[PDB]
From a paper:
Human metapneumovirus (hMPV) is a common cause of lower respiratory tract infection in children, the elderly, and the immunocompromised. The hMPV F protein is indispensable for hMPV infection, and is highly conserved among hMPV subgroups. Furthermore, the hMPV F protein is the sole target of neutralizing antibodies. The hMPV F protein contains a single site that is cleaved to convert the polypeptide F0 protein into the meta-stable disulfide-linked F1-F2 pre-fusion homotrimer.
Crystals were harvested and X-ray diffraction data was collected, and the structure of the complex was determined to 3.1 Å. The asymmetric unit contained one hMPV F protomer with one MPV458-Fab molecule. hMPV F was observed in the pre-fusion conformation, although no trimeric structure was observed when viewing symmetry related partners. The primary epitope consists of a single alpha helix of amino acids 66–87 of the F2 region. Upon overlay with the previously determined X-ray crystal structure of pre-fusion hMPV F, it is clear the major epitope lies completely within the interface between two protomers of trimeric hMPV F. This unusual epitope suggests the hMPV F protein is partially monomeric on the surface of the virion envelope or on hMPV infected cells, and/or substantial breathing of the hMPV F protein takes place to allow the antibody to bind and neutralize the virus. MPV458 has an unusually short HCDR3 loop of just 8 amino acids. The HCDR3 and light chain CDR (LCDR) 3 are centered on the 66–87 helix region. The HCDR3 interacts via Asp107 with Arg79 of hMPV F, while HCDR2 Asn64 and Ser63 interact with hMPV F Glu80 and Arg205, respectively. The light chain LCDR3 has more hydrogen bonding events than the HCDR3, utilizing the backbone amino group of Leu114 to interact with hMPV F Thr83, Arg115 to hMPV F Asp87, and Asp108 to hMPV F Lys82. The Framework 3 loop of the light chain interacts with the glycan motif consisting of NAG-NAG-BMA with branched MAN residues off the BMA glycan, in which Tyr83 interacts with the extended MAN glycan, while the long-face of Tyr83 sits parallel to the extended glycan, suggesting a favorable interaction with the glycan motif.
Residue numbers in the entry:
A (entry chain H): 1 to 9, 11 to 30, 35 to 59, 62 to 72, 74 to 108, 114 to 232
B (entry chain L): 1 to 29, 36 to 57, 65 to 72, 74 to 80, 83 to 109, 114 to 234
C (entry chain F): 19 to 91, 112 to 350, 358 to 430
The structure:
């Protein structure tokens, strides 16, 4: 088979418009209709709209009836969604699917409906309150706070430490800024030996920072 | 319109067992039902069309039954890489519609969490706000109560939890809570604990620190 | 045809037409059968047959959507509301089953409806037949890249009627504005005209003007029932023919008094027929249409009027403004040019360029005298007979 490729998702303010696109290759685009279906982070799958092979008949989910419009251009083999008057509920990944031969979906684009501006993360450390005794396992990690938008990425000692690493999903603050954490557990003994450094990368504001995290050797 | 209603809410089962998801159509859609599998951060994959046909290269284990309004997706012996979410979809007409989905989870022996607490950093407090953080490390089942305590006083609504996906190695989860205060109120108190309760702990683990000495 | 130029009124009467009056509506119900495509599936990837199959399947689904939306909450609103009524009658459960059973044995039947009305009922079975006996077997256990190309191409040419029907109805919310050949072929039209409740002479005239019969009708989607599509087509019934008719065209007739215009204008333009009962007047151009020497009029558009055709003593319909209107009025056999109020009016030929400029004050041009008449760079082409 061929494929579907979506494009044009990004950030957009609550009440403006955005035009998503889907590019068809490898099958007879002129004799299949298609759907848009979206899924808001976490939530399930929701159908949005459909257009028939001829382009001349369209139908919408009531979520977006009166704001969204679907269109089909057989000349350039491509289908579009013109969303207008975006609300926060519209935040989701937007998916292109072939009707009646439903095996063929696109991979998605993220439409993030937020009134916030690009911002790099402040990267604070997290180490225990106190020296502990010589034994057990001990946890450290860094806290990546107040950045926009979602694609942030963290590693340990330039990908050299992986075992017992846990990076969490970010949370959405009342400010409209994401903050997430990343922890690693090592044997509580060997923290006076090894050097544990946090590697954060936030490409949207072209940010790249390292933070050395210092626990206390023990007794 | 047409309502698919999918059961169960969620499902937990050990690798090898027999999974049975059911979908019920608000009206009779006759055999116009697809079953999709999707793994997190990935586009859904069609497994079963026409309520019973296997798509090509889909393994022997998967099977669909139904005609009319009551449909059944079934796996015979679950396998590691069958852990995902599954959705039914109807296409009686052009207005398609999906089921609410069902979430699959490898089932495991109870394992209680390692609890760790972290105080805000000097670096962060130079800026005007304080993030206390609590970490529940490598537990099962998912369900846990993290309760924050400032001076043995029970907090509410200043906390955000966030929990990872099940581990592919040990089938455990991990949870991270963030208690956020202004520097003003962070310094108006001394004792900062988080009290975890979970099925693998015989009593609830409370983990704290005092504002001054780190 | 005798066109006479009445100079006192700036008018033409063209005489010796022959009427064709629409007196009713014939109803032809169609069951287009798709056959069992639900259990046919392709598993060997891209294929001409797979695409045409998927295309059929999705057409069924589209029509199911269109019928769902159709929910009670060249066609007059009168004609259409009539048809919607008939269709409500046919959309009942009972009535559909009646018609389906009427067409078990034969391809074509006169079904009666629960109210008493008789409707023709056709079965269009070419696709179901092709699907049930030719395609299901050539698909050997879910494999559609068949080496038999002639079969594939035949599927592609056998579902053309169905998909075109589904397009025409879906693109109009289930009420087409006229009758494509996908709705009713010419065979079926002629067959249905011949069964109409009128005498052999009106049937003969209708069969000589099939295209005019079709122009005046329309279709309504009934519904999707299994793997079949039920729709109706309303044909016009010309239950009365050959009464005499004449058309009256006119323009303003003003005399000029050094600044002041003393105008006159008839207000009875249109088509007239002296049929039995009254003399009838059809006032709008959309109302009556000519082919050759016959004039086809919708009797629903008729006003009854008294005996007329004098000059004006009797009280003729005419105006007496002081205001001019310069314009061209094309009669079946020529033109009436009304030239006033600082404007340039002329005759024109398609070979020789500018044949004779025209004088202010309503002139009449026979169509053998010109091909063109213009008023200030607006060009009217005369009718040629
Ligand atoms: C090829 O395709 C054709 C259609 O184009 C299929 O024909 C249909 O086959 C199905 C069988 O699956 C028939 O559907 C069944 O309907 C029953 C109830 O409807 C009837 O009820 C009364 C009597 O109760 C009848 O008198 C009346 O006419 C109604 O039509 C149900 O009891 C059935 O449901 C059961 O089976 C399914 C599993 O498949 C379970 O999920 C349900 O829980 C329940 O156990 C069944 O759905 C249908 O009527 C047929 N239509 C026609 C026109 O024949 C062919 O079957 C198909 N070929 C194959 C091999 O599937
Ligand atoms: C369908 O099959 C019959 C018998 O096999 C044959 O006579 C007929 O011509 C076929 N029609 C087409 C269009 O293939």
């Amino acid at each position: 088979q061929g494929k579907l490729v979506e494009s044009g998702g990004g950030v957009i303010q609550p009440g403006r418009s955005l035009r998503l696109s889907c590019a068809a290759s490898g099958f007879d685009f002129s004799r299949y209709g298609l759907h848009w279906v979206r899924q808001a982070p976490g939530k399930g799958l929701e159908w949005v709209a459909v257009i028939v092979y001829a382009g001349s008949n369209k139908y919408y989910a009531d979520s977006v009836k009166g704001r969204f419009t679907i269109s089909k251009d057989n000349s350039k083999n491509t289908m579009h969604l013109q969303m207008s008057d975006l609300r926060t509920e519209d935040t989701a990944v937007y998916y292109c699917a072939r009707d009646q031969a439903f095996d063929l979906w696109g991979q998605g684009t993220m439409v993030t409906v937020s009134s916030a501006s690009t911002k790099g993360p402040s990267v604070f450390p997290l180490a225990p309150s106190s020296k502990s005794t010589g034994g057990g396992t001990a946890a450290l990690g860094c806290l990546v706070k107040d950045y926009f938008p979602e694609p942030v990425t963290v590693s340990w000692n330039s990908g050299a430490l992986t075992s017992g690493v846990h990076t969490f999903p970010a949370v959405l603050q009342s400010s409209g800024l994401y903050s997430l954490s990343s922890v690693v557990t090592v044997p509580s003994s060997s923290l006076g030996t090894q050097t544990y450094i946090c590697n954060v990368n936030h490409k949207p504001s072209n940010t790249k920072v390292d933070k050395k995290v210092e626990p206390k050797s023990c007794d | 319109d047409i309502q698919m209603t999918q059961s169960p809410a969620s499902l937990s089962a050990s690798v090898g067992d027999r999974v049975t998801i059911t979908c019920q159509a608000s009206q009779g859609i006759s055999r116009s039902v697809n079953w999709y599998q999707q793994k997190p951060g990935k586009a859904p994959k069609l497994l079963i069309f026409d309520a019973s046909h296997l798509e090509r290269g889909v393994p022997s284990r998967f099977s669909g039954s139904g005609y009319g309004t009551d449909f059944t997706f079934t796996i015979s012996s679950l396998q590691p890489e069958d852990i995902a979410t599954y959705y039914c979809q109807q296409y009686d007409n052009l207005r398609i519609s999906f089921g609410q989905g069902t979430r699959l989870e490898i089932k495991r022996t109870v394992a209680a969490p390692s609890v760790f607490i972290f105080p805000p950093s000097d670096e962060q407090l130079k800026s005007g706000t304080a993030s206390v953080v609590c970490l529940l490390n490598n537990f099962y089942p998912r369900e846990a109560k993290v309760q924050w305590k400032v001076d043995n006083a029970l907090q509410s609504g200043n906390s955000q939890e966030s929990v990872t996906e099940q581990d592919s190695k040990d089938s455990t989860y991990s949870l991270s809570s963030t208690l956020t205060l202004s520097k003003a109120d962070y310094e108006k108190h001394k004792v900062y604990a988080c009290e975890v309760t979970h099925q693998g702990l015989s009593s609830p683990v409370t983990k704290s620190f005092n504002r001054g000495e780190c | 045809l005798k066109e006479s130029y009445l100079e006192e009124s700036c008018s033409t009467i063209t005489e010796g037409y022959l009427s064709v009056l629409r007196t009713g509506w014939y109803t032809n119900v169609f069951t287009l059968e798709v056959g069992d495509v639900e259990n046919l599936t392709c598993t060997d990837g891209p294929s001409l047959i797979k695409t045409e199959l998927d295309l059929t399947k999705s057409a069924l689904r589209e029509l199911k959507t269109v019928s769902a939306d159709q929910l009670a909450r060249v066609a007059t609103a009168a004609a259409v509301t009539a048809g919607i009524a008939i269709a409500k009658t046919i959309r009942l459960e009972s009535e559909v089953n009646a018609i389906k059973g009427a067409l078990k044995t034969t391809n074509e039947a006169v079904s009666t409806l629960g109210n008493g009305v008789r409707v023709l009922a056709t079965a269009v079975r070419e696709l179901k037949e092709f699907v049930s006996k030719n395609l299901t077997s050539a698909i050997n256990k879910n494999k559609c890249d068949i080496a038999d190309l002639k079969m594939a191409v035949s599927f592609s040419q056998f579902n053309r009627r169905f998909l075109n029907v589904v397009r025409q109805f879906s693109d109009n919310a289930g009420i087409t504005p006229a009758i494509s050949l996908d709705l009713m072929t010419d065979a079926e039209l002629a067959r249905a005209v011949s069964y109409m409740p009128t005498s052999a002479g009106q049937i003969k005239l209708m069969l000589e003007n099939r295209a005019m019969v079709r122009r005046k009708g329309f279709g309504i989607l009934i519904g999707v029932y299994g793997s079949s599509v039920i729709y109706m087509v309303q044909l016009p019934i010309f239950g009365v023919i050959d009464t005499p008719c004449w058309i009256i065209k006119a323009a303003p007739s003003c005399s000029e008094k050094d600044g002041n215009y003393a105008c006159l204008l008839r207000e009875d333009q249109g088509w007239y027929c002296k049929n039995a009962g009254s003399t009838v007047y059809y006032p709008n151009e959309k109302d009556c249409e000519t082919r050759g020497d016959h004039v086809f009029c919708d009797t629903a558009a008729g006003i009854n009027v008294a005996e007329q055709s004098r000059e004006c003593n009797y009280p003729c319909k005419v105006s007496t403004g002081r205001h001019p209107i310069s314009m061209v009025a094309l009669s079946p056999l020529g033109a009436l040019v009304a030239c006033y109020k600082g404007v340039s009016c002329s005759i024109g030929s398609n070979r020789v360029g500018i044949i004779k400029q025209l004088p202010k004050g309503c002139s009449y041009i026979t169509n053998q005298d010109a091909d063109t008449v213009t008023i200030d760079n607006t060009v009217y082409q005369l009718s040629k007979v």
